[PDB]
PDB file of C-alpha atoms (C1' of nucleotides) in Angstrom:
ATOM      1  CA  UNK A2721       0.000   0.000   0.000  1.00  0.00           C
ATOM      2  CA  UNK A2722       2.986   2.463   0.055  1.00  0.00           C
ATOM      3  CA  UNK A2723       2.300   4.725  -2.416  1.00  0.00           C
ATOM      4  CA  UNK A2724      -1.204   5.106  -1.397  1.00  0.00           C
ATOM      5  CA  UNK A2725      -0.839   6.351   2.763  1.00  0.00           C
ATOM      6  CA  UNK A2726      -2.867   9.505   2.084  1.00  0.00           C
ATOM      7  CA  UNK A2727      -5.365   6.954   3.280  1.00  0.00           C
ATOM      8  CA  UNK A2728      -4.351   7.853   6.727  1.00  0.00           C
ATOM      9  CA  UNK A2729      -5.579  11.634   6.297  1.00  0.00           C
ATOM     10  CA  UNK A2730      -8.504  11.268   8.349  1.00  0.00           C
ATOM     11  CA  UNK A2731     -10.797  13.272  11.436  1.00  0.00           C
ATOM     12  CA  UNK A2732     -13.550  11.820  14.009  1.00  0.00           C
ATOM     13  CA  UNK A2733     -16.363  12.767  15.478  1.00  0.00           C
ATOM     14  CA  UNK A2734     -16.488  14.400  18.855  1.00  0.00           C
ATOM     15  CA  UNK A2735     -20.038  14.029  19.754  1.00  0.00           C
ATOM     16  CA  UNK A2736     -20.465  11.161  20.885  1.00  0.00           C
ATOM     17  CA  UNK A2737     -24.337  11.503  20.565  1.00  0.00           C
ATOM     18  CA  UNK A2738     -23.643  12.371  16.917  1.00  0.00           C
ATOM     19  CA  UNK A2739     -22.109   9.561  16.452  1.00  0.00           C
ATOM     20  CA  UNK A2740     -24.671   7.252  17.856  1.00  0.00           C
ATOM     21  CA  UNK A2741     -26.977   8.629  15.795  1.00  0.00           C
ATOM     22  CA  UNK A2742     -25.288   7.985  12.777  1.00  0.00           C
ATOM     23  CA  UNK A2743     -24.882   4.176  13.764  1.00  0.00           C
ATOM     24  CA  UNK A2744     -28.468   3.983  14.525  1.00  0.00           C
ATOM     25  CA  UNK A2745     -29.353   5.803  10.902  1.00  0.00           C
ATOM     26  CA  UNK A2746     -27.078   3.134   9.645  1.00  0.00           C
ATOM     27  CA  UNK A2747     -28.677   0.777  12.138  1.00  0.00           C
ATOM     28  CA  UNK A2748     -32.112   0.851  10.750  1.00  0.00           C
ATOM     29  CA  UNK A2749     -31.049   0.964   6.929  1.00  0.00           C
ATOM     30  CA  UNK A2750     -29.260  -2.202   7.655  1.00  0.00           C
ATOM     31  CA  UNK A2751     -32.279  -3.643   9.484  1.00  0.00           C
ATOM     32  CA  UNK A2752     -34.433  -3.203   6.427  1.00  0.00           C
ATOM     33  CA  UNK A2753     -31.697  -4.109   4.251  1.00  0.00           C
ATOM     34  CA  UNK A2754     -31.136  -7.565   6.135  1.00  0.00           C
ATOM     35  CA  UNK A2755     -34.722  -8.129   5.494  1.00  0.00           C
ATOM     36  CA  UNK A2756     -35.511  -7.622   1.616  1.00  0.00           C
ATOM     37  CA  UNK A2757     -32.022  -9.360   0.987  1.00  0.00           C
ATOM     38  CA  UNK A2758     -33.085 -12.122   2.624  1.00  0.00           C
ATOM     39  CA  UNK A2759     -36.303 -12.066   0.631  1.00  0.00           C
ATOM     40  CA  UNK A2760     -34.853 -11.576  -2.652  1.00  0.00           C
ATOM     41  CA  UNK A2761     -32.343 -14.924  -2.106  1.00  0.00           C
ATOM     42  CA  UNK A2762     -35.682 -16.239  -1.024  1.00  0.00           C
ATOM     43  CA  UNK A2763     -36.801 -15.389  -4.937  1.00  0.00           C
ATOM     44  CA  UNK A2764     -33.081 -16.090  -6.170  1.00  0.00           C
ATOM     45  CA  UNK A2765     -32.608 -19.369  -4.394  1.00  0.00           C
ATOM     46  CA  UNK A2766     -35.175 -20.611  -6.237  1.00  0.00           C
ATOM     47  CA  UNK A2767     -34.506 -19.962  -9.909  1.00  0.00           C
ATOM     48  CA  UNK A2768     -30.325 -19.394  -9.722  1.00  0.00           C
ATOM     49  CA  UNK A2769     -29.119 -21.922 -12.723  1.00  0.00           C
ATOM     50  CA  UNK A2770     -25.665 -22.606 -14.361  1.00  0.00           C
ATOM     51  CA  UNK A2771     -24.807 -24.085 -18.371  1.00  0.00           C
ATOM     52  CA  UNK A2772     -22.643 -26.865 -18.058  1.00  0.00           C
ATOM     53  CA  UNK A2773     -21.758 -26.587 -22.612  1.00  0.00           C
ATOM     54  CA  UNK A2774     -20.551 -22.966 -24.391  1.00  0.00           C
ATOM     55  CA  UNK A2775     -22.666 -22.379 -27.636  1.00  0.00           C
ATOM     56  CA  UNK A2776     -21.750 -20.977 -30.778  1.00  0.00           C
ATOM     57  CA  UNK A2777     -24.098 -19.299 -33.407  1.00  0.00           C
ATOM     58  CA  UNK A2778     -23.933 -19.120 -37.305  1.00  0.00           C
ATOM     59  CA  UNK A2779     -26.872 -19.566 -40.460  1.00  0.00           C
ATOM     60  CA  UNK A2780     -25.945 -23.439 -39.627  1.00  0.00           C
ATOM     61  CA  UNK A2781     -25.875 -26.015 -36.584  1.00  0.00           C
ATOM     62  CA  UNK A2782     -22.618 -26.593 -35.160  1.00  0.00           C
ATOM     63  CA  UNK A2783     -22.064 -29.708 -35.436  1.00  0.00           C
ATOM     64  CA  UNK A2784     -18.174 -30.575 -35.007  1.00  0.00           C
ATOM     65  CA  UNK A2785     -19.058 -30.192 -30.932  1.00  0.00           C
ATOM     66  CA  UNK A2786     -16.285 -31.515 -28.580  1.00  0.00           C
ATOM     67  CA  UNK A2787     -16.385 -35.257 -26.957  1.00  0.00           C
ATOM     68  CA  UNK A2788     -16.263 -32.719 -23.391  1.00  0.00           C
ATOM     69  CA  UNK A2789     -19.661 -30.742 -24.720  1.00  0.00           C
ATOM     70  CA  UNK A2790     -22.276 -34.126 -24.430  1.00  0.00           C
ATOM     71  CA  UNK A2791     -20.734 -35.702 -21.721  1.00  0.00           C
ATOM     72  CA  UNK A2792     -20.658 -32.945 -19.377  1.00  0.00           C
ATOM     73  CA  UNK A2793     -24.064 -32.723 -19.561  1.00  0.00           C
ATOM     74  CA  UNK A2794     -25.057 -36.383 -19.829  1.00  0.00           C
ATOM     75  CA  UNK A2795     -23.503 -36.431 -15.852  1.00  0.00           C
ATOM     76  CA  UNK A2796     -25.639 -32.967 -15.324  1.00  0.00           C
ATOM     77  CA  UNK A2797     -28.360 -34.508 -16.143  1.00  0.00           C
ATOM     78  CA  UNK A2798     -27.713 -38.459 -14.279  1.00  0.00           C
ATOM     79  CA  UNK A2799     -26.334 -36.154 -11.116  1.00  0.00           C
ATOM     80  CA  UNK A2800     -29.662 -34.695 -10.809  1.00  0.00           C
ATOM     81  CA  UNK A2801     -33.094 -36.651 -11.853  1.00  0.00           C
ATOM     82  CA  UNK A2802     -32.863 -40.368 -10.800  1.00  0.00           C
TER      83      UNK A2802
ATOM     84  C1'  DT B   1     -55.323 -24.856 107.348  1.00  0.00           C
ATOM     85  C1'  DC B   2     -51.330 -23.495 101.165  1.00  0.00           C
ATOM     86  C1'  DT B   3     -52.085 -20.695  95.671  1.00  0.00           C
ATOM     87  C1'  DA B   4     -49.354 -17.067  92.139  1.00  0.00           C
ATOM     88  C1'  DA B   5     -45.856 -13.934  91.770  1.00  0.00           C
ATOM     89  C1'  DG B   6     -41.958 -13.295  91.447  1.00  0.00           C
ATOM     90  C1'  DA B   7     -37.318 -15.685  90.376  1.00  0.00           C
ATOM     91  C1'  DA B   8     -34.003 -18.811  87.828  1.00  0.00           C
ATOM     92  C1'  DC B   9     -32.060 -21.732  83.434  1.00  0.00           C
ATOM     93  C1'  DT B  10     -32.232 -23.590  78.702  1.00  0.00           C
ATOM     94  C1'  DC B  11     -33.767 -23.545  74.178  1.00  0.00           C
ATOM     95  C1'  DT B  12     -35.693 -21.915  69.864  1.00  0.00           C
ATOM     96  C1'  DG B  13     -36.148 -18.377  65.970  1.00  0.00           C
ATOM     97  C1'  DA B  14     -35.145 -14.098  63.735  1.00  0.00           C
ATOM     98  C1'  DT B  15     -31.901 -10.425  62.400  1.00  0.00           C
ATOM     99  C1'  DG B  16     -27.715  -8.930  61.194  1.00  0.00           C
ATOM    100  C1'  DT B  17     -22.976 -10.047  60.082  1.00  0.00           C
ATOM    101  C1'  DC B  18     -18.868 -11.553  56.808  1.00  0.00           C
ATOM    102  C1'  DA B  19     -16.579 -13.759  52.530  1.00  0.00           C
ATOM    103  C1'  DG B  20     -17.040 -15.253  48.594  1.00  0.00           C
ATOM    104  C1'  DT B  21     -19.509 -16.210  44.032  1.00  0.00           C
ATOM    105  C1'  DA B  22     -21.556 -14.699  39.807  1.00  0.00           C
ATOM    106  C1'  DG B  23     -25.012 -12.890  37.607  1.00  0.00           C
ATOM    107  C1'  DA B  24     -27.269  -8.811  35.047  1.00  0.00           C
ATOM    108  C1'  DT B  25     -26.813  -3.708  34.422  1.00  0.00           C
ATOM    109  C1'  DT B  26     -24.746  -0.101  32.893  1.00  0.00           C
ATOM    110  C1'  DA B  27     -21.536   2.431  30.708  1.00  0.00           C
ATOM    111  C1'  DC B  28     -18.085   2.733  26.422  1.00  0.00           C
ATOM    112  C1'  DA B  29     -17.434   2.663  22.316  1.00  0.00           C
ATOM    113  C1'  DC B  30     -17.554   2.136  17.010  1.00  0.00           C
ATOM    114  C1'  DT B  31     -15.565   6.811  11.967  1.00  0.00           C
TER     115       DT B  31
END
DNA sequence: TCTAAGAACTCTGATGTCAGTAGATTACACT
């Protein structure tokens, strides 16, 4: 970090009461925060998915697909619905 | 011709004491 100790160039607070008042402004932001995160991973949990082959495009299929491309998701599949 | 008022002692039960233990309350503090 040596080049970069302006970072140290700082003040504080003196009222304390100030202060606490800024932690509880933070305090209740946070608070409702906490909550609608917690109900959008509710949502996202959910529906979150991943693609186990890349894709190309073009005015034809692609058919000269790698051995890696169908067998990757051939275990996707067998890893997941019995 | 005797029946209670006055002792006396021990014992029981509460109140306050000290030392030590540990919990909950209250301050202190975050940039």
């Amino acid at each position: 970090g040596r080049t970069d100790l302006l970072r140290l160039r700082r003040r504080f607070m003196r009222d304390q009461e100030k202060l606490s008042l800024m932690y509880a402004r933070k305090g209740v932001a946070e608070q409702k925060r906490e909550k609608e995160i917690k109900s959008e991973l509710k949502m996202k949990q959910d529906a979150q998915v991943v693609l186990y082959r890349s894709y190309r495009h073009g005015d034809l299929p692609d058919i000269q697909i790698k051995h890696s491309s169908l067998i990757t998701p051939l275990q996707a599949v067998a890893q997941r619905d019995p």
